[PDB]
Amino acid sequence: MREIVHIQAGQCGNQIGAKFWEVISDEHGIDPSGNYVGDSDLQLERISVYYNEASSHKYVPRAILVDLEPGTMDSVRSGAFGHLFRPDNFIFGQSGAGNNWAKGHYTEGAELVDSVLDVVRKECENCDCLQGFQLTHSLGGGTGSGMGTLLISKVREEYPDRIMNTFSVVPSPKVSDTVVEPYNATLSIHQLVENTDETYCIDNEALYDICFRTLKLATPTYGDLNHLVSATMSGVTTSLRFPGQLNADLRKLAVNMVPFPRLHFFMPGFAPLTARGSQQYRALTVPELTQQMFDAKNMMAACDPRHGRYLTVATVFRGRMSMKEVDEQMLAIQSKNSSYFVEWIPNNVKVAVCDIPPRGLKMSSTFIGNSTAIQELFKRISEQFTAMFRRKAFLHWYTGEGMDEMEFTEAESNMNDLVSEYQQY
Amino acid sequence: MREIVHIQAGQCGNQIGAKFWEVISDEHGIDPSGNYVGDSDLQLERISVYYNEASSHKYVPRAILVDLEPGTMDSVRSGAFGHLFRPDNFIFGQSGAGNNWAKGHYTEGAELVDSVLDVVRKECENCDCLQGFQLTHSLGGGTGSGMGTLLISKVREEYPDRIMNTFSVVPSPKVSDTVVEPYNATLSIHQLVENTDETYCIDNEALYDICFRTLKLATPTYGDLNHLVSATMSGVTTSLRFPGQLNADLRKLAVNMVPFPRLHFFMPGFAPLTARGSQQYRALTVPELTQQMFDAKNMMAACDPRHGRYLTVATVFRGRMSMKEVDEQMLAIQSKNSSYFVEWIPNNVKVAVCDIPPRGLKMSSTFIGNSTAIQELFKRISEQFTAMFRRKAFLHWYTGEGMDEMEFTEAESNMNDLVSEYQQY
Amino acid sequence: MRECISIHVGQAGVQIGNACWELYCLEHGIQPDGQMPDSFNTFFSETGAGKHVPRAVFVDLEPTVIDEVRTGTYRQLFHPEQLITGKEDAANNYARGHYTIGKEIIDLVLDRIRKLADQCTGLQGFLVFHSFGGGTGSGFTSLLMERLSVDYGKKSKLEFSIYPAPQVSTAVVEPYNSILTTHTTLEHSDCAFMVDNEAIYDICRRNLDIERPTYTNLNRLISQIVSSITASLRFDGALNVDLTDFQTNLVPYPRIHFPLATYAPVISAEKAYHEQLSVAEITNACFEPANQMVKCDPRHGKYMACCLLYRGDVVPKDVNAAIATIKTKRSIQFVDWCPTGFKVGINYQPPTVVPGGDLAKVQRAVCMLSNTTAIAEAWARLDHKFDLMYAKRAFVHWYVGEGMEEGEFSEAREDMAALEKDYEEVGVDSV
Amino acid sequence: MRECISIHVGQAGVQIGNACWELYCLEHGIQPDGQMPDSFNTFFSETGAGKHVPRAVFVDLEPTVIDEVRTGTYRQLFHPEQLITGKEDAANNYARGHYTIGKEIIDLVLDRIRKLADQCTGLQGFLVFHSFGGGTGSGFTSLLMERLSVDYGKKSKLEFSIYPAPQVSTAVVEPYNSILTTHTTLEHSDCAFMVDNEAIYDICRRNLDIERPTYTNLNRLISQIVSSITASLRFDGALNVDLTDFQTNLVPYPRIHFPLATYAPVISAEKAYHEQLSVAEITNACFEPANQMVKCDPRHGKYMACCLLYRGDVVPKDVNAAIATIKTKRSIQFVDWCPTGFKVGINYQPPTVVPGGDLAKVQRAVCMLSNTTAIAEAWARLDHKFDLMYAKRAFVHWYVGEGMEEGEFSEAREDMAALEKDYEEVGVDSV
């Protein structure tokens, strides 16, 4: 019932997906060997949305791990929770596409996407009522960006009515981890605009800021960043899964935050983020959670909402809390920041409340924000893309793989249309 | 009661028959020395269809092992379950016929077929109610193809009303194990069309695909392939032997899958095929068995059913299962694949259900398919045969043994008539 | 005195007989060995001691099902000579069960039935349990019915047949066997109470909360239907109904004799606890189109005769009020030539719950045998499938090479066309 | 005899039904398993034994809330077949609950409601509990009400709806769903008793001393309102008032049928100890603008009809004196075309205190249903929000790509404008 197919593409996607399945198994009380060792019945009440029951009551995640290099597959398999995924769902190639969008979308992406599409078709036909798909990847990468894009397009043309939502790691503003990041990001965004229902844009530098300033982590590794992203994913599909006072699945959130088809890029967030030192001085209340989630420092994308206006927001609360406090905090937030919300949408907040909090917490909440400040991120990508494209730098790789400059022009025109739409609204 | 005479001809036939008798003795709890060491009474309830009770309550298989070379006889006798067959039922010659159909059908096949016919007459006159015969052989071989053909013809003209069904290993599409494979296969098929009731076409390359892709066997040997073929044979005659909710002997299957006398070539299959790694993640249910048996990857002949239309299918289920689930799965399969079933035969599925599953399993099922995709196999054989025959390659062997080119022309004309009939229907 | 003989042919018939005789032994207090720790006379015979031998034969051309009977918990209930079995079944072939394999067994079956009839004093008739789409359930059933008509040309012959389902099907040659059986037995039968496996599956899922029923639950429901039908012979009630009553009140014309069976209080334990199942409620459930045990929508046709067999704590006034309510309904329409289309039977014995079954213990129940023109659509579907398969001439060689001719195929199809025409004619209003 | 069926749609409706049926079981002495260690007949049915099955359906498109009901303390009270649930909710989308997801469930709900109606003898009407700003609470509620009007075109249909609050809100698309529901149900409804979560929050804070109330306390207060409304059917009193009485006395024109609910003795234990709550005091509290459970100031409009439902130790003379005092007040103004704007009902049963609740045990209580033109301001606010969101065309793609057209949006907005015009017209004085 309302089964979700999870696809992890590339190194970033595979690592974030491994952390995501760790936190999900923690929520549902699933042993790293696949056995249920939980305590409450609500964990197995809706285990079907993410897991498939095998023969000996062992739960196999409904996840497809796709990459163009075997190193990440070996790392995921060898580590903890690596004996959890189905061994037939590791679909990988040998050559790793470099950091080339064209390689991952046109040359090796073809064979690997045929194989992964067969696997995805099997997984979907196994499902009872498919709610939709979720993809984890990075736009600035190689196999990640291009292959996630190709899979998104093909699954979309196969299943147009399902909800396709992606948790994509966007390029950072200050320091880039890939020289050709603008090209891959621009092409990936051009493809994501038309074939995705919900794109949660995550930047690693905002995550570094959160870890250093809010969690006071001296040496934040990728494990902590992936844990944060996994907590966001958790929160959303937990509103989907567990019982609550005000339920909301993926489609309800999509309806309440996508006023127009192309305006589906969100800044995620997580409210109860405290350092180990300050956990004893802070009161965990709905006002505290709301004040933190609406703070511009907590948002997981390096886009200041004070530079734009919130088209819509979604607050997915978790835990036993009073609906009056949630609604009054929402009203106070809208009244105080009336200049930061769009006037032509009254009640720009969609509230969902789930009864089961995450492990180790009494209250929690995730913030999703459809704001016109993503236009800043797309503008940065556009300036970098046009700076490299004007002098035609690193372009012979993409051209030789089989692309054309016309595709680059179309991608940049589509992204400029996106920024124009955001600025207009 | 309903005794079956089993004849193994050639190397392929003898090895597959050895594996078959191993699995049958496992099913009926027969010691490799011939003694009953089982647990349930149903094993001895119908032991008579395959075994003959000897003096000291020792069960001798009703099997005739015929070959034109003594190496296979020695290998079968020396190995485990080799002291099970009657020593008077090893009928072999010295010269091994090479890979020549004419040698095994006209020169040495004559003397050896007189001897084996005497043995078969003794075995049949010993029987109480003969249900029919079953032959294991290879069409691309020497003594196997030609001698199995000669024995089939002679036993057919002796016992026309009995059921003669053969499990023949057909040539593979990609790689051939014998240079003269098309000649032997064409002559054998020309003789099988008129003198056989049920020919289960098995290709070694489909078996390799099953072992590598479905069973994840790193080094599949002929033991595993023979085990698969033996499981298919088991399933069929187990529907014959053990009690069930919906019984079906050999003749019932023959009636329900042979709409026309010459259209009796089947693609066998086996549903519960799982790798040792994935046995814990898979739920053993009737829908799972049906989905696997109707999958084009599971079928044991390299002929894609999506390239043709199923004239008829037979599902022989084994184990305690609900008849409603079986019937609803059959109906769903027919409705979903309505384009892959013949329109002029409503209810193209014949369902049989036996109560006793194979050892080590809770549920099982064998798939038999009379489809118009065997025409692809016969077409490949025809192209290869005409390619070699046009330039008269390797023909002087067959001519010198005592044949004529007119026999080759008749064989290819008959096989072309077979492909014409399949394409017409 | 009113002894009746039940004949179970084929696997379906034998398993339904297993369920039926389990139910009879439970109802009459007979232990599964025939001993008791009259009412039990129309179906059982006493042999000196407390041994009660059921008045039935179990005939099949396959040793498997009969051997399961011979070694089951009821191994010592049935007379060993009345469990007749062959060696090779009919293999879903009508010709095998009627011409080739059935001719080697029919004499033994007739001898055993003659022994049973001689043991009786007044023979009411025969109950033939079989399936339409089976080899021995079709060919041997038709052969046996014709031989019985030759011998007992006056006793009623009621048959409980599993009509092929509209969509689900376990055999490929079911239309051939069904059409040929309909031909041959329609020549020589009184009335055939019909049932579908698909409809009982739907009933089980919707009412009994079972998502994975087997043939066992279907057989238990069918046995409940048969028990409700024969309660009047087996017990005492306000309004008794005999087999001849069924034949007279349900068959308006000699060929139109295919009523559909129904059973209202099909309910689980918890739902039965939460309900107050009364005469009106069970009658309305009987006339609900979703509770029919033959997958034919009654709203597509007109009722010509209904036989409501109540049992248990039932009051005649409540039955009359419920039937008046049904008649006042507008969705339920009758043919214009049957102003009185209700035969009512009331029995004082409430239905007996089988230990291990799914039906809950109820105070009253009703079985409704309805002859309706909605079965004409099912006949049309069956003959359409027959027409497709025969136009391609598929599987015809199996029948022809076994003592039959294609002329018989054509004649059976023409007879079925005549039956469809008869249903159409009786459907239309008089002018 | 005067049986009434309550229908709970969506999460809000199902949870309010949980509170309501807890209150009913406590009032009638029924244990949470349906057994008791008449009055309990308009809302419960007896099944043979002491089992009392409530006469209600719990329908939602989401398994979560219904499954909480199925496994709670009342797991064995409700009939398992009357707890209808879907697989995927309407996701705050009217189109999903009305066109796409609601069409796969409406037949089952109608079948269950037909079963309940047949089980009844005289059906007074339906009580529909739902929320205005929910997916299934709007779309499925409108669909169900229209189907009921098609089927039961004469029985009264009273709906208890959670009107969206002026400021607090849990969903972003509430104006769309509210306007579309108002359109569709306003076509096919008798009267809608309205309530706001924000107003009940304010009532709880001011009167019950609770600073952190949950939905549970709100549901308990709403259940008290419903119990006061249905006490006349469930108990005996000096002045009985039926559902048709509500419909007649509260609805002056077919479209103006949105009264506001109120409950006077909302008080904690200590404050109840220190007070002497009498008929005059509770009546004055009912007419206090701060005690309204819909956040609309009554002084901004004119009353057109009031329904004072007293219960407990209430004397008719005291009620008359209190109502005369209210009429002599100058802050409370009525429309000039209603010289008599008071329907009075008195019941002998004092309100029952739920163990674990916050309301104190009182000797008397009054529920006031007031139809007033102050709801016109709330309608104006709702349509203003709708106009903003529709002018930007936000979220419209979600509705359109689910079986709806923008023409329906325009038509619903025009209908709401007509409703505002009607309220303005009935507000003005006659000349």
Coordinates of N, CA and C in Angstrom, one line a residue, chain C residues 5 19 38 48 84 88 123 126 135 149 165 206 219 229 240 271 275 279 300 317 339 354 362 398 409 417 430:
Chain C
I5 N -30.7 -41.8 -3.3 CA -29.3 -42.3 -3.5 C -28.5 -41.1 -4.2
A19 N -17.4 -33.6 1.7 CA -18.0 -32.5 2.5 C -19.4 -32.8 2.9
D38 N -36.0 -43.7 10.5 CA -35.8 -42.5 11.3 C -35.4 -41.3 10.4
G48 N -27.9 -54.2 11.1 CA -27.9 -55.0 12.3 C -27.5 -54.3 13.6
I84 N -16.3 -47.0 -6.1 CA -15.9 -47.5 -7.4 C -14.9 -46.6 -8.0
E88 N -7.3 -45.4 -15.3 CA -6.9 -44.2 -16.0 C -8.1 -43.3 -16.2
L123 N -37.9 -45.4 -3.4 CA -36.8 -44.6 -3.9 C -37.3 -43.2 -4.5
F126 N -32.4 -39.7 -7.5 CA -30.9 -39.7 -7.4 C -30.4 -38.3 -7.3
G135 N -13.5 -34.6 -17.4 CA -13.6 -35.7 -18.3 C -14.7 -36.7 -17.8
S149 N -31.9 -43.4 -16.8 CA -33.2 -43.1 -17.5 C -33.7 -44.4 -18.2
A165 N -17.0 -21.3 -14.8 CA -17.0 -19.9 -14.4 C -16.9 -19.0 -15.6
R206 N -16.1 -11.8 0.3 CA -17.0 -10.6 0.7 C -17.6 -10.9 2.1
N219 N -16.6 -26.6 -1.0 CA -17.3 -27.8 -0.8 C -18.2 -27.7 0.4
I229 N -31.4 -28.4 1.0 CA -32.3 -29.0 0.1 C -32.9 -30.3 0.6
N240 N -43.1 -29.3 4.3 CA -42.2 -30.3 3.7 C -42.2 -30.2 2.2
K271 N -19.1 -11.2 12.6 CA -20.2 -10.5 11.9 C -21.5 -11.0 12.3
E275 N -24.8 -9.0 14.0 CA -26.0 -8.9 13.2 C -27.2 -9.6 13.9
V279 N -35.7 -13.5 9.1 CA -36.2 -14.0 7.9 C -36.2 -13.0 6.8
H300 N -30.2 -9.1 -15.2 CA -30.2 -9.2 -16.7 C -31.3 -10.1 -17.2
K317 N -45.4 -16.6 9.1 CA -45.9 -15.2 8.8 C -44.7 -14.3 8.4
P339 N -47.5 -15.8 -12.4 CA -48.0 -14.9 -11.3 C -47.6 -15.4 -9.9
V354 N -20.1 -27.1 11.0 CA -19.0 -28.1 10.9 C -17.8 -27.6 11.8
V362 N -25.9 -20.2 13.3 CA -27.0 -19.3 13.1 C -28.3 -20.0 13.6
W398 N -8.4 -35.0 -30.3 CA -8.5 -35.8 -29.1 C -9.8 -36.4 -28.9
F409 N -20.2 -33.1 -32.5 CA -19.9 -31.7 -32.1 C -21.0 -30.8 -32.7
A417 N -27.9 -24.1 -29.4 CA -28.5 -23.0 -30.1 C -30.0 -23.1 -29.9
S430 N -45.9 -12.3 -22.8 CA -47.0 -12.7 -23.6 C -47.8 -11.5 -24.1

